[PDB]
Amino acid sequence: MIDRYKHQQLRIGLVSPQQISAWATGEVTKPYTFHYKTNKPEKDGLFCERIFGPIKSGICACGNYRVIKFCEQCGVEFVDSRIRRYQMGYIKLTCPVTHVWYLKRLPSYIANLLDKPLKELEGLVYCDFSFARPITKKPTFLRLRGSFEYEIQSWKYSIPLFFTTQGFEIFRNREISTGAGAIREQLADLDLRIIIENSLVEWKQLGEEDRKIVRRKDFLVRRMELAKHFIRTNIEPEWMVLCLLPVLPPELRPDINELYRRVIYRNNTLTDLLVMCQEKLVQEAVDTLLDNGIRGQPMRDGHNKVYKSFSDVIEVIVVGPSLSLHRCGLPREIAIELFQTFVIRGLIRQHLASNIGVAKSQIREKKPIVWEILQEVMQGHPVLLNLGIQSFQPILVEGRTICLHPLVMAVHVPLSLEAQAEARLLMFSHMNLLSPAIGDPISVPTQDMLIGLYVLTSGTRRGICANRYNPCEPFFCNSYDAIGAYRQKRINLDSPLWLRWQLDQRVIASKEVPIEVHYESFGNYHEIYAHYLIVRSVKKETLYIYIRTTVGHISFYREIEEAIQGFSQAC
Amino acid sequence: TSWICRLCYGRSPTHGDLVELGEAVGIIAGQSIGEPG
Amino acid sequence: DAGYLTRRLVEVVQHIVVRRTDCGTIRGISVSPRNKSRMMSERIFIQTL
Amino acid sequence: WFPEEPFEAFKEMRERKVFDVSDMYTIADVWGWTWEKDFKNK
Amino acid sequence: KVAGRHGNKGIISKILPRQDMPYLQDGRPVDMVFNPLGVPSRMNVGQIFECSLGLAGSLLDRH
Amino acid sequence: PYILKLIMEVWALEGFGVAHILQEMLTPESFRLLVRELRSLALELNHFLVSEKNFQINRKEV
Amino acid sequence: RILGIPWGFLIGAELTIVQSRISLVNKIQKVYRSQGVQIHNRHIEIIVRQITSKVLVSEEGMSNVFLPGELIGLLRAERTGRALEEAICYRAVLLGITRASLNTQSFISEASFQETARVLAKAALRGRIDWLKGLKENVVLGGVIPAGTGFNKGDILFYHREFC
Amino acid sequence: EVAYATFENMEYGEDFMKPDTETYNWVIQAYTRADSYDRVQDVAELLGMMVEDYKRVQPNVKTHALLVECFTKYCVVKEAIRHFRALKNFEGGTKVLHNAGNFEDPLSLYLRALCREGRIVELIDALDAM
């Protein structure tokens, strides 16, 4: 047949600054959590109602109420308060910061894409370094290149004075730059197609020519693999440097709040100055918020606790022997809670309760009509008990405990008809009689059940355990007479007897010839075996069988035979 | 390696017939080895 | 130690579902009852068949 | 254990039906590419 | 839940009238019936010594 | 004697093939909350449905 | 050194993989059978198939189809060898069940198993797509799993009578 | 992926549903003209599956034109040359590869890739076919 096709996909990607803004609009600009006096969310704070929505459904910041678009006085949208679980905000960083995932997690992605060692690239972010000629798509006129650990002497006084400060700032961040912003300019100016060709030719040169050549080859394959994925996707490599910082919705942060406060505090400080030392403080704080435990000693609060980042965030029964195999017993106190919705419906359906409110009071007050309804709705409704989890048909029992059959706390009630069908037709304790491991039976009798069968079928004593001296029993017409004699204490459970047998010879026994054959001269002969006697003739076609057994063996045979016959008659 | 067919798996142990379409036999194999640990 | 192994075992094959009647393969695994170097157990060899 | 010797292991692969010469074909010889032998090994 | 002093712990599953209980040759019904299969697997024979000696002490007015 | 008185489930459901019972016992807020936490790391996780009839892509509201 | 192109790699990988599967199943079944635990070989063969179903593209095999050091399926590598001569050189690799669980077709399954941050960082940079074929993928999404009951999507002649 | 799901329905179905040459051409064409992501590995595995079905399935003119177009786009030039040689023997031939100038004109891309790599002897043979 034709498959019922179902095409669903989910993808993750790095997010542009534009998408970050589109999520929020929404800018959090103040490090305030909650006002001390009014105990209200601070305006433009981490819990602001401009940015994340009302804390009360339909109630605005000023207190105006409307039935469930923006208030004229405050601007709160008159919607459900649940929007605070899903509404994002964002922080506008004065200086771009690298994403710690793509810089510090070895192997570094930014370092591999730029073909610069992480050491010479980490100092550009956390040390007092500067990178010359960050870009290559615009005119430049200085012969500087690479990373400068110190500062250029002429670049401090002579060059800014010669071109004037106002005219110098225009082309300043084109000859030599610093911070994570310099990295973003390198990423944005990368020619990804040049990377592939340069990596391929360098890779082939090393092939023509021991622990470094192999390692450098793996570096080149990773770099050209990385460039190819950027080309065929809509992910820009410059998004690895964050310009905006998305802010988690307040309801998911009722640690993270303090980390947000630190980022806002330093970012607000940096924009007041407008320095490089302050940029490091902003960049380091964002690293702590995104993924701590990547720089060495992580940030710790005053109570000697290491701050958790987002990377840390993402990373009685009583036996009942009379029960059937497919049934279980539930107490009234447990059953009425599990089935309350059905008891309420049954009361309304049969007009014993006018509505839902009245139906609750009768359950509350233990009105006896409740228990009649509870028995009705429970019938035919299986529950799941947690082959650790199975499905049983519950029955109401006296007492306060859950009663389980001897071959077996969470109780689940399937609600939908689809779930009720699965429970009855797939999870019941009689279509799962074989284990999947090798196909063995699961519910074999054990312990006291097994001892009872063993004693029942341990037959008569034999030989020197039956007779004190070397010998140099009742006959029963049918098995019911033998069992009846046992009930009247005429024989014991293991006393030997002869049973007239009117079926075929189906007695499991040692494959042995007769111990003795008694052959009468008129033609009849008796064949005496270890467990049965067969009477035959050379004149007639007679064949009479008598089995030497006990009522215990008869009882075991009858129980299985009557079980099979009883089930057949009932079905 | 992302799925198996009825004939390559064979008979079901719990049901006696050839294994049915839609059976999560990977999870069953995982339990059948982990549980006797 | 048993639970950690069970979690890893389930994880590696969690996606395997019986999805076709017959993949139409031609290859098969050959099994021989009379290897010349060791008398294979009969019951075990039967159970693997 | 398959034999450590290569040509013995090839023989055991055929005896146990792991791999035989009926599996040795390329796109050139099953799609009738008779001209490709002219462009190779020259 | 009940327990002896030999790690023999049990959960009460059934309460019977005194006329349904097994009774001794003096006619007295017993108060509790424990499963004897719990002893060999748990290997706590000390409960067997204690129960016998407890019966003797009660009849002899001894501790 | 002296007697005193005292004071994987998902895998099993999958092995049974009871897909609708499993859906009930799990239910979405678990996944919607996951998307927001991933958004805090500048990652977006979009769920798209491709129609098997007209091949039009629908972005689910997550 | 004996066979040529897509025959040295193809036949060599078959011999290694077949030998590995035979010894892996025997070793596992030796442990359980000494403790008296009976498990059908079906279940063990399913696990071992995942361990021995991958090849590693050799360091010298560079092309626009495969890159050296790439992990590709054994069946995919066999089929490409018959159809191309583009330096598809590969060796069979034995992946432990942990390493095999982190090289699947679903980044959601890997991220919920182990090393979530490393899995998500790599997938996000290439815009990875999960088509939600497996079971745990759909459990996380809260849908219906594609198995069991979820498998395979679950007036003329009036007013025209005889006047009479 | 939409076309590949239908192909899998056929490849692992009953005998009357098995893929024919046209079935392979449709699935190959779906991957060659995919909007995003690298698909050259998918095409090369489908080609290997088609070759394994040689006793029942044989190529036609569209099979080679699609394969020349795919390998040229991904700059697997040596494989595009093998399939162009097979395309020459089919009447019509290069006109099918030209696709009336649609899909970035695969005929011109094959010629450009031969020129860019100094495979001039192959380039002249391509012009003879045209």
Rounded to whole angstroms, the Cα distance separating A547 from A534 reads 9
C-alpha to C-alpha distances, H124 to A359, A474, H74, H78, H111, nearest whole angstrom: 91, 112, 22, 16, 9
For an interface test with F, give the residue of A4, A6, A9, A430 to mutate (most F CBs within 10 A).
A9
Chain A residues touching residue E35 (CB < 8 angstroms): 448
User: A435 near B14, Cβ under 8 Å?
Assistant: yes
Contacts of E11 (CB under 8 A, 6+ apart): A316, A318, E1, E2
A472 is an annotated ligand-binding site residue: no
Hey, are the CB atoms on D27 and G7 less than 8 Å from each other? Answer: no
Chain B residues touching residue A437 (CB < 8 angstroms): 13, 32, 35-36
Q: Which residues of H touch D (CB under 8 A)?
A: 47, 51, 54, 58-59, 82, 85-86
Alpha helices in H1-130 (DSSP H): 2-11, 21-32, 40-52, 61-73, 77-88, 94-98, 106-116, 120-129
Which method resolved this structure? cryo-EM
Burial A485-504 (b: 16+ CB within 10 A, else e): bbeeeebeebbbbbbebeee
Element (H, E) at F45: strand F43-50
Rounded to whole angstroms, the Cα distance separating A101 from F41 reads 9
Rg (CA), chain A: 44
User: G124 near G117, Cβ under 8 Å?
Assistant: no
C-alpha to C-alpha distances, A171 to A164, A186, A284, nearest whole angstrom: 12, 16, 28
| DSSP single-letter state for residue A41 | B
D24: alpha, beta or left, given left = phi > 0 and alpha = psi -120 to 50?
beta
Hey, are the CB atoms on H38 and A2 less than 8 Å from each other? Answer: no
SS3 call for A230: helix
SS3 call for A294: coil
Strand B4-5 to C18-20 pairing = parallel
Neighbours of chain A (3+ CB pairs under 8 A): B, E, F, G, H
Rounded to whole angstroms, the Cα distance separating A278 from A280 reads 5
Give the CA diameter of chain B. Answer: 29
Rounded to whole angstroms, the Cα distance separating C24 from G101 reads 27
Asked if A438 has any chain B CB less than 8 Å from its own CB, the reply is: yes
Q: How many helices (H) and strands (E) does chain E have?
A: 2, 2
Q: In angstroms, what separates the C-alpha of C20 from chain F's closest C-alpha?
A: 16
Question: Comparing C-alpha atoms, which of G4, G15, G2, G1 is closest to residue G91?
Answer: G15
Beta strands in A226-326 (DSSP E): 241-247, 317-319
Hey, are the CB atoms on F2 and E50 less than 8 Å from each other? Answer: yes
Question: Comparing C-alpha atoms, which of A187, A221, A227, A186 is closest to residue A202?
Answer: A221
Beta strands in A189-252 (DSSP E): 241-247
Beta strands in A459-566 (DSSP E): 475-476, 497-501, 516-519, 524-528, 532-537, 543-549
The token duo for F21 is 């019972």
Give me the helix-helix angle, H61-73 and H77-88, nearest 10°: 160
Question: Comparing C-alpha atoms, which of B10, B36, B37 is closest to residue B23?
Answer: B10
∠ CA(H24), CA(H29), CA(H35), 5° rounding?
140
Rounded to whole angstroms, the Cα distance separating A301 from E36 reads 60
Chain A residues touching residue E13 (CB < 8 angstroms): 318-320
SS3 call for H27: helix
Hey, are the CB atoms on H76 and G63 less than 8 Å from each other? Answer: yes
User: H71 near D16, Cβ under 8 Å?
Assistant: no
H57: alpha, beta or left, given left = phi > 0 and alpha = psi -120 to 50?
beta
The token duo for H109 is 């891309």
∠ CA(G137), CA(H41), CA(H13), 5° rounding?
65
User: A125 near A96, Cβ under 8 Å?
Assistant: no
G79 half-sphere exposure, CB direction, 13 A CA radius? 19
User: A28 near A91, Cβ under 8 Å?
Assistant: yes
A496 preceded by a cis bond (ω within 30 of 0): no
User: Which DSSP string corresponds to chain G?
Assistant: --S-TTTHHHHHHHHHHHHHHHHHHHHHHHHHHHTT----HHHHHHHHHHHTSEEEE-TT--SSS--TT-EEEHHHHHHHHHH--S---EEEE---HHHHHTSSS-HHHHHTTS-HHHHHHHHHHHT-EE---SHHHHHHHTS--SSGGGTT---TTSS-S---
Rounded to whole angstroms, the Cα distance separating F44 from F61 reads 13
Hey, are the CB atoms on D2 and G82 less than 8 Å from each other? Answer: no
The token duo for A247 is 């802010």
Hey, are the CB atoms on F15 and B22 less than 8 Å from each other? Answer: no
Element (H, E) at H89: none
G31 half-sphere exposure, CB direction, 13 A CA radius? 9
Rounded to whole angstroms, the Cα distance separating A95 from A282 reads 8
Count of CB atoms within 10 A of residue B32's CB?
A: 23
Hey, are the CB atoms on C5 and B7 less than 8 Å from each other? Answer: no
The torsion angle over the Cα atoms of residues G76, G82, G84 and G90, rounded to 10 degrees, is 50
Nominal resolution in Å? Answer: 2.5
**Within its chain, how far is the Cα of A144 from the centroid?**
56
User: A423 near A382, Cβ under 8 Å?
Assistant: yes
Rounded to whole angstroms, the Cα distance separating G144 from A214 reads 47
Tell me whether residue A263 is exposed, middle or buried, using C-beta atoms within 10 angstroms of its C-beta: 0 to 12, 13 to 18, 19 or more: buried
Neighbours of chain E (3+ CB pairs under 8 A): A, F
Rounded to whole angstroms, the Cα distance separating A196 from A136 reads 18
Question: Comparing C-alpha atoms, which of H64, H66, H3, H63 is closest to residue H30?
Answer: H3
Rounded to whole angstroms, the Cα distance separating A221 from A213 reads 12
**Within its chain, how far is the Cα of G47 from the centroid?**
12
Q: How many CB pairs under 8 A join A and E?
A: 10
| DSSP single-letter state for residue A431 | S
φ, ψ dihedrals at A407, nearest 5°: -90, 15
Question: Comparing C-alpha atoms, which of H42, B16, B34 is closest to residue A434?
Answer: B16
Tell me whether residue H96 is exposed, middle or buried, using C-beta atoms within 10 angstroms of its C-beta: 0 to 12, 13 to 18, 19 or more: buried
Element (H, E) at C19: strand C18-20
The torsion angle over the Cα atoms of residues A207, A211, A214 and A218, rounded to 10 degrees, is -150
Question: Comparing C-alpha atoms, which of H84, H50, H52 is closest to residue H67?
Answer: H84
Rounded to whole angstroms, the Cα distance separating A525 from A554 reads 27
The token duo for A205 is 């040169």
Contacts of G142 (CB under 8 A, 6+ apart): F23, F26, F27, F28, F30, F31
Nearest CA in chain C to F17: C17
Asked if H9 has any chain G CB less than 8 Å from its own CB, the reply is: no
User: A98 near A285, Cβ under 8 Å?
Assistant: no
Q: Tally the residues of chain F.
A: 62
Give the CA diameter of chain G. Answer: 104
Strand G54-57 to G71-73 pairing = antiparallel
Contacts of H19 (CB under 8 A, 6+ apart): H7, H10, H11, H53, H57
Count of CB atoms within 10 A of residue A21's CB?
A: 16
Asked if C14 has any chain D CB less than 8 Å from its own CB, the reply is: no
Asked if B32 has any chain F CB less than 8 Å from its own CB, the reply is: no
**Within its chain, how far is the Cα of A356 from the centroid?**
36
Q: In angstroms, what separates the C-alpha of H5 from chain F's closest C-alpha?
A: 10
∠ CA(G143), CA(G123), CA(G94), 5° rounding?
95
A 212-251 residues with CB < 8 A to H: 228, 232-234
Rounded to whole angstroms, the Cα distance separating A219 from A207 reads 14
Element (H, E) at A281: helix A276-290
**Within its chain, how far is the Cα of A390 from the centroid?**
19
Burial A30-56 (b: 16+ CB within 10 A, else e): ebbbeeeeeeebbbebbbbbbbbbbbe
Rg (CA), chain F: 22
Burial A176-215 (b: 16+ CB within 10 A, else e): bbbbbbbbbbbbeebeeeebbebbeebbeeeeeeeeeeee
Rounded to whole angstroms, the Cα distance separating G125 from A107 reads 14
A277 is an annotated ligand-binding site residue: no
Rounded to whole angstroms, the Cα distance separating A487 from E11 reads 34
